[PDB]
Every structure is written in structure tokens, then in C-alpha cells.
Target: Catabolite gene activator
Amino acid sequence: PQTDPTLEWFLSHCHIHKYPSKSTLIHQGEKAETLYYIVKGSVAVLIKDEEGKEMILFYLNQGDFIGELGLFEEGQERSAWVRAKTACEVAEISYKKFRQLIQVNPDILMRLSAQMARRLQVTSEKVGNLAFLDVTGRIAQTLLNLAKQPDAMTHPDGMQIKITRQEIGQIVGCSRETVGRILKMLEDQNLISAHGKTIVVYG
Amino acid sequence: DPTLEWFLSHCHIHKYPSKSTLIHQGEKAETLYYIVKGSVAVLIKDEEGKEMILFYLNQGDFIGELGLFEEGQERSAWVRAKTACEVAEISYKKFRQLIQVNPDILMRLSAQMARRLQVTSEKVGNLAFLDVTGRIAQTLLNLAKQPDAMTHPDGMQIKITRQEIGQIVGCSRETVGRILKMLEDQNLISAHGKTIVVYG
Ligand SMILES: Nc1ncnc2c1ncn2[C@@H]1O[C@@H]2COP(=O)(O)O[C@H]2[C@H]1O
Ligand SMILES: Nc1ncnc2c1ncn2[C@@H]1O[C@@H]2COP(=O)(O)O[C@H]2[C@H]1O
Ligand SMILES: Nc1ncnc2c1ncn2[C@@H]1O[C@@H]2COP(=O)(O)O[C@H]2[C@H]1O
Model:
């Protein structure tokens, strides 16, 4: 973690709310009139198809803004669901009040925009993965990213992560069954080791 | 627009012919662009150079903005002129000084980023939830819903090459041809050649 006076100034204008793990902070389709900032915890951003299947777009963490995409034009709806992945503490402020703060000190918009730019780079890559990789390479690539997250744990034969079939499937666009068939196949290829819901990525 | 014209007076403007590349993926990102006239395609490529289009940008669109907020970044995509273009250009350093003078110029840029993230997220959803055949069907349906789709007795009529479809959905013009034929055999469309009729 890390803070500064510009962020504490901003936080003093917000209200703080707690969200237990698995609770939904933002429902797709709601009117977007408020901005969030994660003081503690992590959330998943996700979207759905007509049949209720879920895709994860991003994981956001402490220091991440959320609900920013409606800020620049009135009348918009929330573009995705946002669900607490762990217990969360989340600052919230109306768009109107945030715009007044932007007038006082534009650096607070700089910080928000830097996160938007980063999310657009990552989401564009995600488009390239989904377009150009098959499920297997999507899965292989997903495991590689995690293997280089700050959450990784050292290990003798490589780098180690934990994740469920279901979460993998939600990331890549497939069933937990396809994930299992593919994990097994990667294991037979001596690329990974799986131990329940814990995965050693070799290399 | 005063802000626009103030901003433009700090840029150098240059003309680019159709099909020229304004931005190459991997280059160091140190400058911001703004489209004064024309349209461009933003694209990505697989390892074999098969193309996917991420977005079409037009007059009034910023480009090359994604490196602005941290130094040392590379261009995340290629940007190619789709028509002849006139494009304002300015260094990130000079743009940051303008942001200090008047933050509204950052508001405008951020509004376009937010819109691009909403649209690109919808595209992630389509790619995750639809196969190549469903992506092509959905593309034709969406095109048939645009203001420029023409009325046809059997449905709507659109104009778009196999290559453009392939660029939209992430496949070769060959894969596009086979699926269009399949969709035609399924009595869903007619690919007259001079036109696609989307029935219904
Ligand atoms: N592609 C994405 N990357 C990161 N965060 C996203 C993405 N799409 C949506 N979100 C977040 O999901 C939020 C839900 O509603 P908003 O659209 O107001 O603001 C959104 C963003 O904070
Ligand atoms: N194309 C897809 N096919 C199947 N499941 C998908 C797809 N895209 C996203 N998902 C979601 O990914 C989830 C992961 O595991 P489940 O099989 O429990 O349920 C899955 C779906 O809701
Ligand atoms: N998903 C996207 N939607 C719209 N424009 C994009 C997208 N990804 C990249 N771009 C544009 O492509 C540009 C090329 O280099 P930059 O990364 O500096 O800035 C980029 C954006 O202007």
C-alpha cells in the first residue's frame, strides 16, 4: 500500500462503505451517478451473455477507482457488474461532487485517467487473446499472467498460483469441464502441475 | 470550439494518404495525435500478421493517448489511415503543460477513453461468447442495423468486403468466404457479391 495528501483530500469528500466478500457493489444497467475508490480489498469486474454466462474483465484492487465510465456524460448506465472478491472498504462520491474536486485540483483526474488508459491497454490485449488464441492457449496464457502476479508463491519446479476451474473458465470463456480437460492436457505435456485448486506453472 | 482551436494551435498538423501507417505498435510513445480530418483503423495482429481491428476513429478523435500517463511505454497497436487524413500532433510534455492551463482538454480526452473502454469491453464479451460463425453473423446483423444499411425487399442490404469482415472478427478472408456460403446455404443471407442481403 501507499497514500498521499492528494488522495486523503479526495477521500475526505467520500463516504466509506463495507462490502463482504461476494457482495455486488455495482449492477450492470444501473444509472451511473457515483464514482468509487477501493480503500481496501479486491473486486472482479464482469459481464454476462443472454444465457447468464459470466466473463471476468478485470480484477481491481486497493487504490483502484471503480464506476468511472459514466463520469463524462450524464444518463449512462453501469457497463458491467462489480463484485467483491474479498471483504472490501470502498469510498464513494457523486459524479457532481467529483467534478467540483477536479476543478480544485486536476491531478485527481490525472490519476483516474492513468487507470483508464491502463485498463484500455489490458482490455485490448484481452481482445487479441480471445481473437487469436484457442481455448488452450488462452488458458496457457492466463496461467502465465497469474504466475507473474504479486500473489505468486515460489516453488522448486517453478512458480505457483491458486485458482479454480470455474475462475479460469470465466476468464477465458469456457466451461469448468473444458478447463479440467485442458489442465490435464497441459499437465501431460509437462507444463504444469495441478494439486486440487493449486497450480504449479513450470518456468 | 475555443478549447479545440487553442489546443490545435500548439500542435503541428500533417497530411497522411489513405493506407499509410500513423502509429506502429511497439514504438516509444511520446506524442499525442488528434484527427482533424479523415478516419483511421486501430489494429492488432497475431504472430503471423493476421489482423484484427479494435476500433475506427474519426475526426475529433484523439489517438496515441495510451502512453500519456507513464513514461517509457510503447504504442499498444498499429493505427492506419482508412481515408486521407489530416492529423494534429503534439508531444506528451507539451500536452501536460496544456492540461495545467486548462484541464477541460484532459476531460475531453478522458471522455473518449471511457467510451473506448465501454465499447472494447462489449467486444471482449462477443469474442468470449460467440464462435467465428457467431461473430460473423453478429457483425452482419450489426451492420444491417447501421444508419447506412440500405432497404432491400428481403431484409437489409450492406456493403462490406470479405477482408473487412475478417478484420472485424479476427479471421482470414478465406474463412469469411466459407462461412458466408454456409450462411447463404442456411437461407440467412444472400451474398450477391455487389452486396450482402441480411434477410428479415
Ligand atoms: N474493461 C474494463 N477494465 C476495467 N474496469 C472495467 C472494464 N469495464 C468496466 N469496468 C469497471 O466496471 C465498472 C462498472 O460501471 P461503470 O461503467 O460506471 O465503470 C466501470 C469500470 O469501473
Ligand atoms: N463461451 C463460454 N462457454 C461456457 N462457459 C462460458 C463461456 N464464456 C464464459 N463462460 C462462463 O465461464 C464459467 C466458468 O465455469 P462454469 O462452467 O461453472 O460456468 C462458466 C460460464 O458462466
Ligand atoms: N481498444 C482501443 N480502442 C480505441 N483506440 C485504441 C484501442 N487500443 C488502442 N487504441 C489506440 O491505438 C493507439 C496506438 O498507440 P497508443 O498506445 O499510444 O494509443 C492508442 C490508442 O489511441
